[PDB]
Ligand binder design. Structure first.
Ligand SMILES: [Mg+2]
Ligand SMILES: [Mg+2]
Ligand SMILES: [Mg+2]
Ligand SMILES: [Mg+2]
Ligand SMILES: [Mg+2]
Ligand SMILES: [Mg+2]
Ligand SMILES: [Mg+2]
Ligand SMILES: [Mg+2]
Ligand SMILES: [Mg+2]
Ligand SMILES: [Mg+2]
Ligand SMILES: [Mg+2]
Ligand SMILES: [Mg+2]
Ligand SMILES: [Mg+2]
Ligand SMILES: [Mg+2]
Ligand SMILES: [Mg+2]
Ligand SMILES: [Mg+2]
Ligand SMILES: [Mg+2]
Ligand SMILES: [Mg+2]
Ligand SMILES: [Mg+2]
Ligand SMILES: [Mg+2]
Ligand SMILES: [Mg+2]
Ligand SMILES: [Mg+2]
Ligand SMILES: [Mg+2]
Ligand SMILES: [Mg+2]
Ligand SMILES: [Mg+2]
Ligand SMILES: [Mg+2]
Ligand SMILES: [Mg+2]
Ligand SMILES: [Mg+2]
Ligand SMILES: [Mg+2]
Ligand SMILES: [Mg+2]
Ligand SMILES: [Mg+2]
Ligand SMILES: [Mg+2]
Ligand SMILES: [Mg+2]
Ligand SMILES: [Mg+2]
Ligand SMILES: [Mg+2]
Ligand SMILES: [Mg+2]
Ligand SMILES: [Mg+2]
Ligand SMILES: [Mg+2]
Ligand SMILES: [Mg+2]
Ligand SMILES: [Mg+2]
Ligand SMILES: [Mg+2]
Ligand SMILES: [Mg+2]
Ligand SMILES: [Mg+2]
Ligand SMILES: [Mg+2]
Ligand SMILES: [Mg+2]
Ligand SMILES: [Mg+2]
Lengths: 44, 92, 103, 77, 62
RNA sequence: AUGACGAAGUGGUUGAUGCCAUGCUUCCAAGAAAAGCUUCUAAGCUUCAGGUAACCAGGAACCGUACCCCAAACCGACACA
RNA sequence: GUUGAGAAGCUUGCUGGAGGUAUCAGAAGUGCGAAUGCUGACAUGAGUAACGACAAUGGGUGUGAAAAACACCCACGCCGAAAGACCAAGGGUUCCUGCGCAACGUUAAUCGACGCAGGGUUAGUCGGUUCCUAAGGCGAGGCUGAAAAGCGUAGUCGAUG
RNA sequence: ACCCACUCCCGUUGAAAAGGUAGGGGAUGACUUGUGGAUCGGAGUGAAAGGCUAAUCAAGCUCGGAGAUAGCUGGUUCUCC
RNA sequence: GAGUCGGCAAACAGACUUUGAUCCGGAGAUCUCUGAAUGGGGGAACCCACCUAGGAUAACCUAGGUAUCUUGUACUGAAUCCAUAGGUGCAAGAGGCGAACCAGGGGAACUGAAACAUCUAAGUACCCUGAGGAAAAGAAAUCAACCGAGAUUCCCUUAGUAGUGGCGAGCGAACGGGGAUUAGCCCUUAAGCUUCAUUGAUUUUAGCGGAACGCUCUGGAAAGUGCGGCCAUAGUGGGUGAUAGCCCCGUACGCGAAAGGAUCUUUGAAGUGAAAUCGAGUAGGACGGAGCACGAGAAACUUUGUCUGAACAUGGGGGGACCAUCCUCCAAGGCUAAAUACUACUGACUGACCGAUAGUGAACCAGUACCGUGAGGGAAAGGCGAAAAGAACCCCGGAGA
């Protein structure tokens, strides 16, 4: 049974990484929200 | 290297059983080096210091071990190791 | 400036040794001090081949709170409080009762 | 954007109101047209995007006085 | 070495004083890497002397 | 493990889905791109620079490399049919 | 033990080891058995079902507090277009050695992908990086759009080639 | 092989939140498959089943409006007259 | 002014310090890499460069520069003759983050109306932009009512009144009055504001001194018992072996700055306000919207998307349809403090606030563990003793538990 998580660190980086978030304005909002909450990890 | 960088490249000899066996059998000496030390900087440092002639330097990076202990997952530093082969006569 | 300093003749004014005198051997940062011959405790020390300790019930002084001792006036033979008489350019410790230096 | 270069008229909002008084958000846009204005002192045609009121201002004030205001306002033609 | 006596020397003298301290630091590192270093205060004090020399060198040659 | 020696080490046949083959034939649904590479000149450069060939000398940096990988080490909460 | 009609009060033995509060007022997060209430602890079922492919074990020896399971030896059986050997992805030290067995391992464990410590990965030629581009991305100016932006030229990235 | 999923049985606090054994269909094609990429919430995608869009679909998830509203169900704690 | 080498969290080592260490405060220096990230690229913390100057001979090293855009300026520069567009250099500036407050652009629905569409929710939530310590507004083309008031902003009233409203549910003034603050200046160019000097005042960022208690009983320990004192501009603080004005640290009170920051000020200098020179595509009008408590109503006024369009103080605006008379003001140019809003942050003080299922989600290594592709969700977990004095040694047990 193939499950939903098929890991690919390259795909993970390009969809959820720091530069993917910084590229847009809503992505920068995620980083602002996660900095304001104090998340130790900011992106993945 | 063209400065006081010569003294910041070699961190010390490696004291393993594989190191001593290499020193005796072959003429290779295992050193701990700075993580940003190129193979040319290591060769020059071992020639300026220790006053020997280096034949070939091979390097490898060593991952620091994690040791998840005592309220969290820690991690030792990544470090670099150099295998330094000299001429047969020299003993460093 | 500490009112009670290392190497000072003091008298125990509170505790099990109340009345005994001694010299301050060590001053600690938790408002505690060590006085010779005062507050002995019997510590059950496990012997170690290293460090040269043979074990046994080792007896040693235990730290005592700084406010449980008083500076000792040898002139009046009693405990005294300590003030600070700041001179023209020097600060020195004097006894409150007699206004005379401790030293 | 749909802004007049002369008057600064831009889109404004408002309501469409039906006979039963249902209100619908709508926009009111300026009557923007592209027009080339002859500038004798430059011997050049300057193409502007103006509302029809902005073209009337150029008739009343002249393209030279209008273009000077455009330079002082910063945005270029 | 206190900065008072460091500040008297010239730039050339200060630069050889740094090269000497760096060689002492390197030698102390070799001893520590083989367990042959009885002292341990020298490691911390040698790098304070290097910091002192570099501080004077920075402020002497403006 | 320890360190020296160490014989024979040749013919026949069979034979790939591997190679020739990015070939050949045929078909229709008509089958990447760019660079490296070769060559030609323009602007420039003209005793130069550059190019070619020979010889000599030297170099080839940095990162990965353990281990599992139809699995108990990956995706399935599990040492999961 | 005792007192009151009651909510309750009072006295005292033991435990406890530093706080409590008469009286009369004043303020309330003021009284719990239910809400398939919420959190934690612990029952019943019950020492019951189960111990995860029906490829399979037997013996000897050792070690050890202890051996069906660890190691070795002699047999037996199973896979063998894999249940063998690799490359990639993914994981990240699980690799090897010494010491160890609380917990983890569906039992025991001396054994382990488990705990503690040390060691171990060496490149001009392998794979990356570097060069080049595909889809596609971003995209100076630019065009467009209330704003945020959208699209896209020059370019610049982007391998699965 | 690989992809699929027609039948029975088992399993149904499963070895498994869809499997297994035995049979079954396609197996040079409108084929299967890896890597990378594009399209998404009244929107996408659909050889069309209202199918699928991270075990969630006649309008995903997440946070906010928000303590929506609930003529409904449940519950509502000491004493006495 | 005598100890010290930060904490969990100590153990041994090696040292430092009355040649004044640790520590506290001011000013400097250094300040890897990522991130607006800015030399180019990128899967953040990585990869690859170029230019200049210097120094090494090998395979480099040191220092600086190299983003884009805006403004200004200099040099060049097409189609195209002059030009212009463009290109290159230089100088200045900006970009990003931050809980709320402010101004503005866009703008729901659930809900209520006991259904629902006008209406409500609400110009709310949310998204976006810009600015500042406040912002905005602001010096009557304003009200009033024939008496007068005299910018703006904020509080209390008027008043749930007038009005508005499928005249339903709802929405909801003003005049007038009482207060807080008070300030007005210019376009024949000012009050102000900014910056740099400059004269004095404070204030802030380390600190210093700081009173006065003994005996006795119980007790492990006294601060508690009993007796007797003293200080108080210091008496209900925190600790100390049980409850301390007099044991310690403090407290009232009085002093203190080499250096930096800040706020008031006295002068001075430029800069700005600055729009130049009294307001024309403006006032008014028609259509369609929005706002004014006002939902078209008998609907004044403001505003503008479309279309038009005056007069010039002998003029013009308003006084809630509209007209006449009267009163009042002078729009189409500007600047302006205070009273007002907010607190992510720093300090002190306080509480008929909580006290570990409470109080922050978080008293503890918590936005952690863990869950999720991700946005995001999101815990549990405090207490030996006064002091480790944390149990030497013996015995059983596997050199265990
Ligand atoms: Mg080699
Ligand atoms: Mg390598
Ligand atoms: Mg390998
Ligand atoms: Mg599962
Ligand atoms: Mg198993
Ligand atoms: Mg499995
Ligand atoms: Mg109960
Ligand atoms: Mg009940
Ligand atoms: Mg039964
Ligand atoms: Mg049974
Ligand atoms: Mg059974
Ligand atoms: Mg089994
Ligand atoms: Mg056992
Ligand atoms: Mg295998
Ligand atoms: Mg591990
Ligand atoms: Mg192993
Ligand atoms: Mg077990
Ligand atoms: Mg292990
Ligand atoms: Mg684009
Ligand atoms: Mg652009
Ligand atoms: Mg490329
Ligand atoms: Mg490839
Ligand atoms: Mg058939
Ligand atoms: Mg149907
Ligand atoms: Mg699904
Ligand atoms: Mg719906
Ligand atoms: Mg609501
Ligand atoms: Mg509800
Ligand atoms: Mg960069
Ligand atoms: Mg970049
Ligand atoms: Mg020309
Ligand atoms: Mg800004
Ligand atoms: Mg309703
Ligand atoms: Mg500011
Ligand atoms: Mg203002
Ligand atoms: Mg009058
Ligand atoms: Mg003092
Ligand atoms: Mg005092
Ligand atoms: Mg007690
Ligand atoms: Mg005017
Ligand atoms: Mg008008
Ligand atoms: Mg008017
Ligand atoms: Mg009237
Ligand atoms: Mg005006
Ligand atoms: Mg809590
Ligand atoms: Mg409790």
């Amino acid at each position: 049974m193939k499950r939903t998580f098929q890991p690919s660190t390259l795909k993970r980086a390009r969809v959820h990484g720091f530069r993917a978030r910084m590229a847009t304005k809503n992505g920068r909002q995620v980083l602002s929200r996660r900095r304001a909450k104090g998340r130790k990890r900011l992106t993945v | 290297m063209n400065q006081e960088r010569v003294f910041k490249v070699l961190l010390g000899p490696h004291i393993s059983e594989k190191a001593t066996g290499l020193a005796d059998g072959k003429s290779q000496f295992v050193f701990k080096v700075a993580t940003d030390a190129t193979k040319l900087e290591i060769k020059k440092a071992v020639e300026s210091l220790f006053s020997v002639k280096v034949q070939r330097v091979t390097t490898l990076n060593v991952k620091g071990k994690t040791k998840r202990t005592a309220r969290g997952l820690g991690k030792r530093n990544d470090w670099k190791k150099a295998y330094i082969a000299l001429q047969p006569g020299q003993d460093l | 400036m500490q009112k009670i300093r290392r190497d000072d003749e003091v008298i125990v004014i509170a505790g099990k040794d109340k009345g005994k005198r001694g010299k301050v051997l060590k001053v600690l940062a938790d408002d505690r001090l060590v006085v010779g011959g005062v507050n002995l405790i019997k510590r059950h020390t496990k012997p170690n081949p290293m460090l040269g300790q043979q074990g046994g019930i080792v007896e040693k002084e235990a730290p005592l709170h700084v406010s449980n001792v008083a500076i000792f006036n040898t002139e009046t033979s009693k405990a005294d409080r300590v003030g600070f008489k700041v001179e023209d350019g020097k600060k020195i410790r004097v006894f409150k009762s007699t206004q005379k230096p401790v030293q | 954007s749909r802004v007049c270069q002369v008057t600064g008229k831009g889109p404004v909002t408002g309501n469409n109101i039906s006979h039963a008084h249902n209100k619908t958000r709508r926009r009111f846009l300026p009557n923007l047209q592209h027009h080339r204005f002859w500038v004798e002192s430059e011997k050049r045609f300057v193409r502007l995007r103006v509302s029809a009121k902005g073209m009337r201002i150029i008739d009343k004030r002249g393209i030279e006085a209008v273009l000077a205001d455009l330079r002082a306002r910063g945005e270029k033609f | 070495m206190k900065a008072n006596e460091l500040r008297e020397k010239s730039v050339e003298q200060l630069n050889e004083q740094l090269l000497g301290l760096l060689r002492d630091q390197f030698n102390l590192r070799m001893q520590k890497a083989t367990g042959q270093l009885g002292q341990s205060h020298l490691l911390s004090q040698v790098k304070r002397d290097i910091a002192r020399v570099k501080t004077v060198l920075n402020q002497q040659a403006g």
